[PDB]
C-alpha cells in the first residue's frame, strides 16, 4: 500500500483542504513533521489499508518509510477526513490493532440469533517486521447463550496482547421477531 506525502512549512491548514489535500502529521520517538496527502488518493488507500495494514508513505527525498494510521479526525458533519496521524514504524515493539477474521457458521445462527461481532480487532504489541494479517477465530459452536472472547484466540508467533483479556470479542444474541409493546 503506497501513499505519497509532502512537506508543510506552516501555512493555513484550511487552504490545504479548500484546495483538495488532507493535512496530517508524522511521528514516533524521534522525528515529527507536518505533512499532507491528496485527499481523493489517500481515501482509495485507507479504504483497504485502514489501520490494520502498514501504509508506506514517501516524500521528495524518495524515502519510502513504513507507517500506519494512529488516528483520523473527522468533520462530524460532512463526515469525512480532516487530518491524519501517521505513526512511523521502527524496529521497536509496537501496539496495534490486528483484524479478527471470525470464520464459520455459528450453530447459534442457523438456530436462532445474530453474531454480534463485539470486537473486530484487538490491540496487540509486536515487531514491525513481524506484523500479522488477521487472527482467525472459531465461531462455529457458539449457541444463543453467551459467547467466546478475549482470552480465547490463537495468538500468532511473537504476538501477545494488550487486552484484559476478559474483553468480550463476540457473542450470539437471539433474533428479534414479532410481539412488542410492554407498557400496555
Amino acid at each position: 500500500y503506497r501513499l505519497k506525502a509532502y512537506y508543510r512549512e506552516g501555512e493555513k491548514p484550511s487552504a490545504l483542504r479548500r484546495a483538495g489535500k488532507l493535512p496530517g502529521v508524522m511521528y514516533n520517538r524521534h522525528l515529527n513533521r507536518k505533512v499532507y496527502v491528496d485527499l481523493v488518493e489517500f481515501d482509495k488507500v485507507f479504504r483497504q489499508a485502514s489501520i490494520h495494514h502498514v501504509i508506506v508513505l514517501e516524500l521528495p527525498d524518495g524515502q519510502s518509510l513504513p507507517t500506519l494510521v494512529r488516528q483520523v479526525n473527522l468533520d462530524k458533519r460532512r463526515r469525512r477526513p480532516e487530518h491524519v496521524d501517521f505513526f512511523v514504524l521502527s524496529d521497536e515493539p509496537v501496539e496495534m490493532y490486528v483484524p479478527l477474521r471470525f470464520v464459520g457458521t455459528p450453530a447459534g445462527v442457523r438456530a436462532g440469533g445474530v453474531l454480534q461481532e463485539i470486537h473486530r480487532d484487538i490491540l496487540v504489541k509486536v515487531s514491525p517486521r513481524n506484523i500479522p494479517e488477521f487472527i482467525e477465530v472459531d465461531v462455529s459452536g457458539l449457541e444463543i447463550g453467551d459467547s467466546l472472547h478475549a482470552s480465547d484466540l490463537k495468538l500468532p508467533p511473537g504476538v501477545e496482547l494488550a487486552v484484559s483479556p476478559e474483553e468480550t470479542i463476540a457473542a450470539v444474541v437471539p433474533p428479534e421477531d414479532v410481539e412488542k409493546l410492554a407498557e400496555e
Binding site: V72, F87, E95, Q116, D121, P175, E176, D177
Partner: protein, 141 residues
C-alpha cells in the same frame, strides 16, 4: 415509550441547538447506521415509530441498536391557558440530536435489507437522514 426511570429534576430549560454532534458520529456497533443531517429534538414516539418500522421490515432477523436517548423533558401548558402561572407539565421526552449523530444502526442483515430498513425509519424522523456503513469509523490504530 422510552424514558428515564429516575431524575433529579422533572423539568429543564429548552437550551440551544448549535454545533456538530459532540459525539456518536461513527458506527461503533452494527454494520450500517442512520446519520442525522439537521439539528432537532427527536421524540420518544418518533424513535419508537422508527425502531418498530425496522423490526417490522425485516421480520424475525438482525439486531437493531437505538443509539439516541430521550432524557430531556418536553413541556406544554394546558389547552387554551394564558401566559403565566408557572411552567407547564411534562408532555414527553426528547433526544437532542445535532448534525452528524448516528441515531440508529443495524446488524446481522443483508445489505439490501439494511437499506430499505433504514430508509423507512428515516421517513418516521422529523429531519433529513443519510445511510452509511463501517468505513473510516475504525477510530484506533
Amino acid at each position: 415509550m422510552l424514558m428515564p426511570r429516575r431524575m433529579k429534576y422533572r423539568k429543564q430549560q429548552r437550551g440551544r441547538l448549535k454545533g456538530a454532534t459532540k459525539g456518536g458520529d461513527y458506527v461503533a456497533f452494527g454494520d450500517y447506521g442512520l446519520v442525522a443531517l439537521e439539528p432537532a429534538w427527536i421524540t420518544a414516539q418518533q424513535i419508537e415509530a422508527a425502531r418498530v418500522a425496522m423490526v417490522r421490515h425485516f421480520r424475525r432477523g438482525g439486531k437493531i441498536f437505538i443509539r439516541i436517548f430521550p432524557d430531556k423533558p418536553y413541556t406544554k401548558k394546558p389547552l387554551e391557558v394564558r401566559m403565566g402561572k408557572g411552567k407547564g407539565n411534562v408532555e414527553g421526552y426528547v433526544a437532542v440530536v445535532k448534525p452528524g449523530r448516528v441515531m440508529f444502526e443495524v446488524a446481522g442483515v443483508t445489505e439490501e435489507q439494511a437499506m430499505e430498513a433504514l430508509r423507512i425509519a428515516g421517513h418516521k424522523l422529523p429531519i433529513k437522514t443519510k445511510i452509511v456503513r463501517r468505513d473510516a469509523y475504525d477510530e484506533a490504530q
